[PDB]
Write a protein that binds this ligand. Structure first.
Ligand SMILES: OC[C@@H]1[C@@H](O)[C@H](O[C@H]2O[C@H](CO)[C@@H](O)[C@H](O)[C@@H]2O)[C@H](O)c2nccn21
Length: 346
């Protein structure tokens, strides 16, 4: 009851920088978003990413780390082993820069040492469309597909597609129908394509079918943020998935808070309550009878959904939230608990 689960996907962010390694404490410093309902002339400012003031309501046990530091990567992979999360679902922004390329190779290498697998979470990069998506899928499978840590499920790579609704089903069909003009089906570049189910079934069911997605995930850690992230819908979403040959990968998270970077977004806060929120959400995923589960997140520190260890910290600039009556690694060990319960259910 300690082995990795390769149907458990944990969303991982590689965008953190340090002055020493990256030239800037990347992402630890971050713009504060203006209030989308708050009128003109806002000067919301920025979080400077100093030791005292970072762009999170929580504070990492590992400090203001670099995602390109091989020693941090080793520690993260040991944390995945503790959590029993076999798949690292890597945020991918199509930066087309040598620093991205280096980082992806470092992550794959570190993952392989611990038998962790890596798949890609394809983000909404500029001018994203099905043609450049195909080209990027080809590039990723070509560059990384023979890496021993590259994930496959029953012989197929798997990609999560964030904000897949931003692209019309008539475009998706070209890529994802077996008859599509630029199909990946039956090619060397075929993959399980997992789209983001947001809103109501009346909208999302025909979209998933007409776009030829292999499955869907929900992402948001905050319960009730969307229809898809409301766990009382998961039984019915799974029933529909099974009836239509789709893979449902609900996303569970331990809490949510992003008010350092989005001070106006307090309605989305979901309190951790010493792990009871995480337990409730993970239980609903398991009870829905799904084949795979995703975890939002390993380390989206801006959104306060991370399971990565956090420590108490009060600086002159901010009093951070922390894991309260739980130890810093509690969310990793509680993840392992739920992975066990999930496996018992399969
Ligand atoms: O991973 C899914 C998606 C991300 O696209 C999204 O990134 C945006 O927001 C973050 C701040 O949270 C910012 O730092 C990024 O540069 C990007 O603009 C964010 O991680 C998120 N939240 C829900 C879904 N996402």
């Amino acid at each position: 009851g300690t082995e990795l689960d390769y149907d458990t996907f944990c969303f991982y962010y590689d965008w953190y920088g340090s002055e020493a390694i990256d030239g800037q404490y990347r992402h630890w410093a971050h713009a504060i978003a203006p209030d989308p309902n708050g009128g003109s002339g806002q000067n919301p400012g920025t979080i400077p990413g100093t030791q005292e003031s970072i762009a999170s309501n929580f504070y990492p046990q590992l400090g203001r780390y670099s995602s390109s530091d091989p020693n941090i990567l080793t520690k993260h992979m040991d944390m995945f082993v503790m959590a029993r999360t076999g798949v690292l679902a890597l945020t991918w922004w199509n930066e087309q820069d040598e620093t991205e390329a280096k980082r992806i190779g470092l992550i794959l290498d570190a993952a392989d040492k611990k038998k962790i697998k890596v798949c890609f979470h394809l983000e909404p990069y500029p001018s994203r469309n099905v043609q450049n998506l195909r080209e990027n899928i080809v590039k990723l499978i070509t560059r990384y597909g023979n890496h021993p840590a590259f994930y496959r499920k029953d012989g197929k790579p798997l990609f999560f597609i964030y904000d897949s609704y931003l692209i019309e089903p008539s475009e998706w069909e070209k890529l994802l129908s077996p008859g599509g003009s630029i199909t990946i089906r039956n090619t060397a570049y075929d993959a399980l394509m997992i789209g983001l189910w947001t809103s109501s079934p009346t909208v999302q069911r025909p979209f998933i079918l007409n776009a030829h997605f292999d499955g869907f995930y929900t992402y948001f850690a905050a319960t009730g943020f969307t229809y898809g992230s409301t766990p009382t819908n998961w039984v019915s979403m799974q029933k529909w998935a099974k009836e239509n040959g789709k893979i449902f990968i609900p996303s569970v998270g331990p809490g949510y808070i992003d008010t350092r970077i989005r001070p106006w977004n307090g309605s989305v806060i979901r309190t951790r309550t010493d792990g009871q929120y995480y337990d409730a959400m993970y239980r609903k995923a398991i009870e829905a009878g799904v084949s795979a589960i995703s975890i939002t997140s390993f380390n989206e520190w801006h959104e306060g959904s991370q399971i990565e260890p956090a420590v108490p910290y009060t600086s002159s600039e901010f009093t951070y939230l922390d894991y309260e009556n739980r130890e810093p690694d509690y969310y990793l060990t509680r993840t392992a608990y739920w992975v066990g319960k999930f496996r018992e259910s399969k």
